[PDB]
Nucleic acid binder design. Structure first.
Length: 254
DNA sequence: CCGGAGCGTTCAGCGTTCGTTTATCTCCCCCTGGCACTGTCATCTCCGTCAGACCGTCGCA
């Protein structure tokens, strides 16, 4: 609320895509219109051609006379948005005139970069606040209810990036000494994510430093059984190494 | 000792919202046509290969 500048236009892509003019929300429109807006936004104001926009929205099988569909989608964007924010260059469209902090993806990138810089500088409270601000950006699943293979690719990429953000965040939480909340939320996540090995290693190191051991090795046994049932292979050697060093009761982690 | 209520799932009435087209309205690109004092023949090449042949050409005999 402290950065609510007058005349500032804010866009939301990390969840359901939305447009905010000075605090009031705009009617984005149809799901394909929303996906076109997302495709034009994530390129950081780079000119995307109409054929590439068609490929991003629809993929391999477009209808024959539906370039005018993208034309009227862009016209509806220019209706909803400013006349000058969306510019037409070389037959394509680009969302220009965006100030800093306008796009939530760029804000997340800057927050992650600042968190990494503070990790390099060793500042725990500052990077903790930066990651707290970062996690308060996306609401629910990214790109909710939009079609297209580009939308699917962005969805899975940003979900994976959020997974690594949670991994780094909670590894730092185990570094600073936050046991209870970490154990609870990682139990919830591994209930949601059954085959994510990194989060389960985080559960192992968290429970080893929290005074709880039985459910830790129970989760580990379930992990090996499910990984053998669904894949037929052996888990990563780092998980076995950390479990072995847990078994010998090494006081370095404690 | 079935009976009712609450709960789970599954479909037919109309009610709104999308997906994909269509003709009209600005802005730009691109091609053909107009210019009415008179003004009516450019242009520098090319040299210190080179080595002799092959060949047709050509005027003298």
């Amino acid at each position: 609320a402290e950065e609510e500048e007058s005349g500032a236009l804010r866009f939301g892509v990390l969840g359901p895509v939305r447009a905010w003019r000075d605090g009031e929300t705009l009617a984005t429109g149809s799901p394909q219109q929303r996906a076109l807006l997302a495709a034009l936004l994530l390129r950081e104001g780079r000119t995307a051609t109409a054929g590439e926009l068609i490929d991003a929205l629809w993929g391999e099988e477009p209808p024959s006379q539906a370039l005018a569909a993208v034309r009227t989608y862009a016209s509806r964007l220019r209706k909803v948005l400013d006349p000058g924010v969306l510019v037409s260059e070389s037959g394509g469209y680009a969302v220009r005139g965006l100030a800093e902090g306008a796009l939530d993806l760029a804000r997340a990138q800057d927050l992650a970069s600042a968190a990494e810089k503070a990790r390099s500088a060793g500042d725990l409270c500052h990077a903790r606040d930066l990651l707290r601000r970062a996690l308060d950006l996306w609401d629910g699943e990214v790109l909710a209810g939009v079609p297209g293979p580009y939308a699917q690719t962005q969805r899975v990429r940003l979900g994976e990036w959020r997974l690594q953000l949670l991994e780094t965040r909670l590894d730092m939480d185990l570094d600073q000494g936050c046991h209870a909340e970490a154990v609870s939320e990682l139990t919830a996540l591994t209930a949601a994510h059954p085959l994510r090995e990194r989060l389960r290693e985080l559960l192992m190191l968290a429970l080893y430093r929290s005074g709880r051991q039985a459910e830790a090795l129970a989760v580990y046994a379930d992990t090996r059984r499910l990984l053998a049932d669904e894949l037929g292979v052996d888990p990563r050697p780092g998980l076995q190494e950390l479990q072995q060093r847990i078994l010998q009761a090494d006081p370095a982690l404690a």
